[PDB]
Amino acid sequence: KKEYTGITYISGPLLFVENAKDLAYGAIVDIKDGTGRVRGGQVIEVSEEYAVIQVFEETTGLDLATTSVSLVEDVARLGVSKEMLGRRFNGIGKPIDGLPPITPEKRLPITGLPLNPVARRKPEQFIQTGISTIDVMNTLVRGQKLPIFSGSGLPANEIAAQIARQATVRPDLSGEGEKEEPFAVVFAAMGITQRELSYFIQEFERTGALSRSVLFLNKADDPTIERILTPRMALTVAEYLAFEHDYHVLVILTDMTNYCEALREIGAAREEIPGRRGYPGYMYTDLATIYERAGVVEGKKGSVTQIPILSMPDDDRTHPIPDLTGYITEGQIQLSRELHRKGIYPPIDPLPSLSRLMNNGVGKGKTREDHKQVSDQLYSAYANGVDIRKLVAIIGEDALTENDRRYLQFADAFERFFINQGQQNRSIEESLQIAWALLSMLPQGELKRISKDHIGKYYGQKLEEIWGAP
């Protein structure tokens, strides 16, 4: 194997090597030093006189006399297989769960190709996450990109793990009748700590969710370039499964802010001049190359749904990261610090949340046909309840009209029975039941969004099940 000696420079993350015309741009190399310890590096610049290499590790043993550089691969690839389901990987594709490496059905470039616009089709069917404020009011449709806007201290890892081990597709509600479409979850974690890593492993092992999952876990002190490669490997596996084996895939990307920070550090390490607010000038197109490889294609039966989780840096929805993410994706689910400190889990605020494709995935043939109007009615009632709850502090309840006390009690029971669901796994029917039992508090005729048929059909139930059962 051809070895390249002739290092001329070592500083920080870079090192220059001479007489290296035969290294392709973007290639992956390895760096063997005087003690024989082998590191890894990527070629970020090549010309006639020398090549620049970014070492993704520390450089504390290197010298200009014993170091050598050798090629391992011309472009970054990933060996995929259908027997990855159940395995854990570190974020550049190496196993960390103590099992043998896999044998690939093929090797794929992790920086995949863009989808052709005339090949997609309109997303049509929904996914049951088991959480009522998401299913009923912000339904997730197969092929959508729905991000979760979290905070600094809010529990987004718990919500991620719960959605991961609860999600399913419901073929019986549609005409399909029988369960023959497979479901898979791909779980990419970026810059997590050891505490969170222990939590995730324990959660995926204690309930058998691992049997249908792939995990790409990337710790906080690992090389940053691995943090850059993690989501691309995840989405490569997802696209392969979906469009070669008809799987329905659900991809979760745990902290896109960690990704953006790594991207900024790398861009600065190559001496690029940044853009607005200090982030790279090309962050929009980068995030787009990640998010936009998701959807449903025409003539195929698989699908790729995507739920990027990110924590708004300073609770600021105008920071570049949530800003661009909102430009690209189709809605957002907004966690709230108030509901969190009030002891509610999961702390989802229905008022600033929104699913943009929801209307094309609900109704008869897809879900129960009262879904849309019940959603709108719950929204309006909760808004009125919140306003009245604010006014009753300066007026006092005795000076309120009757419908107002109705709305007050409604909003209270709403956030105590609908939102605060704990670790229960609610179907869609249980959620619609609870919604109707809550709407039954308001007087009939106040529900001016719903049509009369459904009001006759479902009104009148009272809170029975949520306290008659766990």
């Binding site: 610049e45 006639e48 011309d74 616009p117 090949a119 607005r276 787009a288 998010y291 936009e292 195929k300």
Partner: protein
């Protein structure tokens, strides 16, 4: 012709080597895989190239070839019913070639080189020709596609090809000095195609929507701008404007849209739309689809490609309507391109030439006398979508200074079931005074005064709402009650329009004039009555109301009779008040 090697791959689409003959902003072929890129800086022997796709896998020593010509489009027969990307690449043939993905370095020609067209000459040997003159004819999806001399060509005919049936490449006319004219030519997308003279904005662009055509019109060759809030039904408005207007050809430009742009462009247009007269609407429109993760060069050039195609169809003698899906997503790509060249930002990061580029786009609109002596026009309707609806960003400010009309869609209206959800308070237009004569001569001698009167009623009813919020409607006087009621009647029987009703989908100018005149007459009568001593309650239950509010759904033929008899009925019910 010029050819070199690679000297340095500095990273993301940045190359160099010795190519002394090469010229600025030429299109080049990088590597062996043939990646395309544009030359941005010449130095000594070397030249800097900006590749479009990613360069991972390239190495130094590979060849670099320069085509010798800047970014260009192919203007000829075969573009209608077609779906292109931002640089005129046929997406359908790409798919048929390489599947559901777009592999890098794929090569396809915009015009199908194999299809045969039925040529029909219109010159004979010895004829002098200049730039822009007609040359022949080809039938295409139901209209004669003329064949035009390129705008910079001049000579005398030597020979013409007989009627027959040829391909696009066949040289159908050979000029004397030796140059051959094919069925198509090419044009740099960054140069405005020349014309004789620009005419004035004195003829209206008819949309078929009452509010846009009456309260805020645009002239032939004018420009408007609409914002893009969610839930306001922008797509339905755009489709109605596409299918009902008096434009012969439609060009739709979707630049940098969300992944789900098909859901309302590529699955809707081909089927869910039919013209007034025939089959598919797609037989007279050119789509330019461009999602978010396409290369930035394509997303930035999409606007210019679209406007050049529209200028072609105008120079041919039609009247074109061009719509930009989101110019904010285009300004984003512009900012990114600028940041790669390390320029100083002006405000909010945007380069200091944002306004110049925006004007260089919008100023190609207009009605002209073509080089061939015909008349044609291009009307632009471009959408702007700020971050959180703030009209103070630099893109919106730069736009509003050069457009002629602002149609303010608003979600709060579609929340209360008002369609189309155009806010009549924030909207405006600047073409009304210039358009008045055409109105007097083609609609009615008093049309402008009725339009101002309706505007004034709406203005008063708006300036009255706060006192209605404070106490409620029943607590007001008789005159204030009357103006509230007549304002509701206006904005529920004249402004509002149902795009799916097979009769209310369209409306003429005379139909709208009739409705306005009906309402003004009714209001004059009612004012006289309540001044006389009738209560507003006898008035609200008058039977003439359910006919003045039903006048939308009557056909365009049965409307003159309906109108005259409804006017007589309005006269009658007043006598019972007298």
């Amino acid at each position: 012709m010029i050819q070199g090697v690679i000297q340095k791959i500095a990273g993301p689409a940045v190359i160099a080597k010795g190519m002394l003959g090469a010229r600025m902003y030429d299109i080049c072929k990088v590597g062996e895989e043939g990646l395309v890129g544009e030359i941005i800086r010449l130095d000594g022997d070397t030249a800097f190239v900006q590749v479009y796709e990613d360069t991972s896998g390239l190495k130094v020593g590979e060849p670099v070839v320069s085509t010798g010509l800047p970014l260009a489009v192919e203007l000829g027969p075969g573009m209608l019913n077609g779906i292109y990307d931002g640089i005129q690449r046929p997406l359908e043939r790409i798919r048929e070639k390489t599947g559901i993905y777009i592999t890098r370095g794929v090569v396809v020609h915009a015009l199908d080189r194999e299809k045969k067209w039925a040529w029909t000459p219109m010159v004979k040997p010895g004829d002098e020709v200049r730039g822009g003159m007609v040359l022949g004819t080809v039938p295409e999806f139901g209209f004669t596609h003329k064949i035009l001399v390129p705008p910079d060509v001049r000579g005398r005919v030597k020979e013409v090809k007989p009627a027959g049936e040829y391909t696009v490449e066949e040289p159908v006319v050979v000029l004397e000095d030796g140059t051959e004219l094919k069925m198509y030519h090419t044009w740099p997308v960054r140069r405005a195609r020349p014309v004789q003279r620009k005419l004035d904005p004195n003829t209206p662009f008819l949309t078929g929507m009452r509010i846009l055509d009456v309260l805020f019109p645009v002239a032939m060759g004018g420009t408007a701008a609409i914002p893009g809030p969610f839930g306001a039904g922008k797509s339905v408005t755009q489709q109605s404007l596409a299918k009902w207007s008096n434009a012969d050809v439609v060009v739709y430009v979707g630049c940098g849209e969300r992944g789900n742009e098909m859901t309302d462009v590529l699955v809707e247009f081909p089927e869910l739309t039919d013209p007034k007269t025939g089959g598919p609407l797609m037989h007279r429109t050119v789509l330019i689809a461009n999602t978010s993760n396409m290369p930035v060069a394509a997303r930035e050039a999409s606007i210019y490609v679209g406007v050049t195609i529209a200028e072609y169809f105008r120079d041919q003698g039609f009247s074109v309507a061009l719509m930009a899906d989101s110019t904010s997503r285009w300004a984003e790509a512009l900012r990114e391109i600028s940041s790669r060249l390390e320029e100083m930002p002006a405000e909010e990061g945007y380069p200091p030439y944002l306004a110049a580029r925006l004007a260089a786009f919008y100023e190609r609109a207009g009605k002209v006398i073509t080089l061939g002596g015909e008349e044609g026009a291009v009307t632009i309707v471009g959408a702007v979508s700020p971050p959180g609806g703030d009209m103070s960003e630099p893109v919106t400010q730069s736009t509003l200074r050069i457009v002629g009309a602002f149609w303010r869609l608003d979600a709060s209206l579609a929340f209360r079931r008002h369609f189309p959800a155009i806010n009549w308070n924030g909207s405006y237009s600047l073409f009304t005074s210039a358009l008045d004569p055409w109105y007097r001569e083609n609609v009615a001698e008093d049309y402008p005064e009725l339009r101002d009167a309706i505007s004034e009623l709406l203005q008063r009813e708006a300036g009255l709402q706060e006192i209605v919020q404070l106490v409620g409607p029943d607590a007001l006087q008789d005159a204030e009650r009357l103006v509230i009621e007549v304002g509701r009647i206006i904005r529920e029987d004249f402004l509002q329009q149902n795009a799916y009703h097979e009769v209310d989908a369209y409306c003429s100018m005379k139909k709208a004039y009739g409705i306005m005149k009906m309402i003004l007459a009714f209001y004059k009568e009612a004012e006289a009555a309540i001044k006389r001593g009738v209560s507003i309650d006898e008035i609200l239950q008058l039977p003439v109301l359910e006919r003045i509010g039903r006048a939308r759904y009557v056909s365009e033929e049965e409307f003159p009779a309906y109108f005259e008899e409804a006017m007589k009925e309005i006269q009658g019910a007043f006598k019972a008040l007298a």
